[PDB]
């Protein structure tokens, strides 16, 4: 079925197989799901339905849609542009690490499965050469599993501080260059989709996730990992970090407030069903996130079983959990290098598809907003090459010895936290109060046939902005510092630059409001009347 194959080619992504178990292990195991399902019900469905319906209604790019829906709140589009720029900066480095893992995979013995190399320290131990072994005192002397040592001391060569930026890793730089040039190849030759290439590269991630889950439940001692994954702690619910990270994991995995969802709506015709597609896409995305959570948490439960250390601190808990638990899982398969290279090629495919659609949405929005310059002299591909070069040069600051902290900062403060919360708040205020939810419900009735069931309407008015503003204020007043491996206590200038770019991602809305008020002034009531009123027939 063409409908089943194309939809399944969009449910999976790196935000479900890499970011969700990272956020579910850093911010408490079982306590992450309680604000996960709340935002899933109250902010995933309504805002996903809102952005898809607005994109299909206006049927154009992601920032001029907000121009013709509400010219006052046109700054919501530019914030999504800045979020897209930050994502395209840091969503390609994950593919660089997966390429580096793919480069080292083609060997009869896996690099992350032995306790002897140039990077393995004295406190290493095999954890496989003997059953009872000689641990429980080596663990007191900080015993470390070989994959946990391999990732740090060879993949990125971690340093003891963000102020300790070491030499740039040239192998990772060539990996990033390969990732950017294959993304540019996908831009030029590869837009012509369908054929025999979609029946293979869409069902492949589900087969691999199924076999990885089947292995993960077969791993001994995974009951402890699943219990840690499911049983919640209320003391781990008392902090705002869990709520913020769960809400913005909902917003990130669904591409909510990123900016490409308005472009997704414009691709469909005027009479496509928003409600059924939104419901089934969101439910299947949450389901595959839940399945990947099962797989990784069972694997690290087995890791904590085979070590003497408990579950809470057995992996990195930074954004390399999918690069630590999953390569640990593939070591136990028969014919391990084949499964490892198939896994890493899966990661390349499902990261490259999302990076492709992100950069394509960004470039088509920036050439729709600049129509007379980039559509007359055959320079759209030149702009794509320039954007790729610029994002490759700005992205290289993370590839150093100490750039992992910079990557963690931009991951938690660019397409996450206050940026996504602010954009969702202002989006829902715009639709529910400025454009009018009755008018938008009438537009949805004219589009798909039936109005929203008024639960989504009341979510647009009072539920979603209320809960997101509550989470915003709760994070603001009770500030908690961010720690990389759950204990780092970042320097103040790192928090300063993270908050600076998080502001610059979200201060574009009131700045655009201010310059729109100043540019066309007819005193306050005429200004608000002429800015509230939409443009043309939409």
């Amino acid at each position, epitope marked *: 079925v063409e409908f089943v194959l194309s939809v399944a080619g969009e449910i999976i992504g790196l935000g479900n197989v890499w970011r969700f178990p990272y956020l579910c292990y850093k911010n408490g195991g079982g306590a992450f799901l309680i604000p996960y399902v709340v935002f899933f019900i109250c902010c995933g469905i309504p805002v996903f339905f809102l952005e898809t319906a607005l994109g299909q209604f206006t049927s154009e790019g992601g920032i001029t849609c907000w121009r013709k829906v509400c010219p006052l709140f046109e700054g919501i589009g530019y914030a999504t542009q800045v979020i897209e720029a930050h994502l395209n900066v840091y969503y390609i480095i994950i593919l660089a690490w997966a390429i580096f893992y793919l480069s080292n995979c083609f060997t009869t013995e896996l690099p992350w499965a032995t306790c002897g190399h140039e990077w393995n320290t004295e406190n290493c131990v095999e954890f496989q050469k003997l059953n009872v072994s000689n641990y429980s005192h080596v663990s007191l002397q900080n015993a470390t599993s070989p994959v946990m040592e391999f990732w740090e001391h060879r993949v990125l060569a971690i340093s003891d501080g963000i102020e300790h930026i070491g030499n740039l890793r040239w192998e990772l730089a060539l990996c990033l260059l390969a990732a950017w040039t294959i993304c540019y190849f996908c831009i030029w030759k590869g837009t012509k989709s369908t054929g025999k290439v979609v029946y293979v590269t869409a069902t492949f991630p589900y087969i691999m996730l199924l076999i990885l889950l089947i292995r993960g439940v077969t791993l001994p001692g995974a009951s402890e990992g699943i219990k840690f994954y499911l049983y919640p702690d209320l003391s781990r619910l008392s902090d705002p970090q869990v709520w913020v990270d769960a809400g913005t994991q909902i917003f990130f995995s669904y591409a909510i407030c990123l900016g490409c969802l308005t472009a997704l709506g414009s691709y469909n015709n005027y009479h496509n069903n928003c409600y059924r597609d939104c419901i089934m896409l969101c439910c299947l995305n949450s389901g595959t996130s839940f399945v990947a959570g099962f797989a990784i948490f069972s694997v690290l439960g087995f890791m904590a079983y085979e070590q003497g250390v408990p579950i809470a601190e057995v992996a990195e808990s930074g954004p390399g959990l999918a690069f630590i638990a999953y390569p640990k899982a593939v070591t136990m398969m028969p014919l391990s290098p084949l499964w490892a290279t198939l896994f890493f090629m899966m990661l390349i495919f499902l990261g490259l598809d999302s990076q492709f659609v992100c950069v394509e949405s960004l470039v088509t929005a920036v050439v729709d907003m600049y129509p007379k310059v980039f559509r007359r002299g055959y320079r759209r591909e030149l702009l794509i090459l320039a954007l790729s070069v610029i994002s490759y040069f700005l992205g290289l600051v993370m590839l150093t010895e100490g750039g992992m902290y910079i990557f963690q900062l931009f991951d938690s403060y660019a397409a996450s936290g206050m940026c996504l919360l602010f954009v969702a708040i202002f989006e829902c205020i715009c639709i529910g109060w400025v454009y009018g939810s*009755n*008018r938008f*419900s*009438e537009d949805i*009735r*004219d589009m798909i*046939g*039936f*109005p929203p069931p008024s639960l989504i309407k009341w979510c647009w008015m009072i539920m979603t902005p209320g809960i997101c503003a509550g989470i915003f204020i709760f994070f603001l007043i009770k500030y908690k510092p961010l720690k990389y491996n759950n204990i780092y206590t970042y320097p103040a200038w790192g928090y300063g630059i993270g908050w600076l770019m998080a502001l610059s991602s979200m201060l574009c809305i009131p700045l655009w409001i201010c310059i729109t008020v100043w540019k066309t002034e007819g005193t306050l009531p005429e200004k608000l009347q002429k800015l509230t009123t939409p443009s043309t027939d939409l």
Partner: antibody
Amino acid sequence: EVQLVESGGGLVKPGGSLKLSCAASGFTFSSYAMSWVRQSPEKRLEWVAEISSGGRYIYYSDTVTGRFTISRDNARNILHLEMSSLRSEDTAMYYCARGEVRQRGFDYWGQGTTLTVSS
Amino acid sequence: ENVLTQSPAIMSTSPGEKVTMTCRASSSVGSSYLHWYQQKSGASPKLWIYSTSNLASGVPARFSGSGSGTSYSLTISSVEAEDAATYYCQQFSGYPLTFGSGTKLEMKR
């Protein structure tokens, strides 16, 4: 419970004009779209017009477009349908249907005002 | 103009007898947009079957629509004296909206 009572209608001259009025009660008139359905004296049913729940999405059939206008009033819970240049072919008995969800249909109908055009 | 036609225009059914109407569509219509009505002799039509499978409030369960694509049918198990009327089929897929020709359910004795 819900009464889609209708007024207006009667004998009109050919080429004249008439103003049919449909009054709704027992429900939120501003939350459900409205349509006018006519029934020919040969007992043939056809759709005339449709206005949305707000009043800006207006559709017509190809037999009445240009001469027929449809209005709305969410304050007094009333509906209108004004016609011009009535010929001998658009004589019927007009119903005031109510259809908002397109997967539900015209669930609640009116009574029907007999309309006659003759010389 | 999705010209819908129904055959036969006139029909006669004994009580407790199988009966199946039809509603042929000119162009393709959605499976969830085609409706069925029932107008008694001297009364306003009421919604009978919506989205060709469901039933409106108060409709007995012996009515059951079927079909998809362009060929749609209305099946009644055991008719009685309470449902002698005319049935029309509508579509909301394409504009302008069209109705069926109408099948008159008659009784013999």
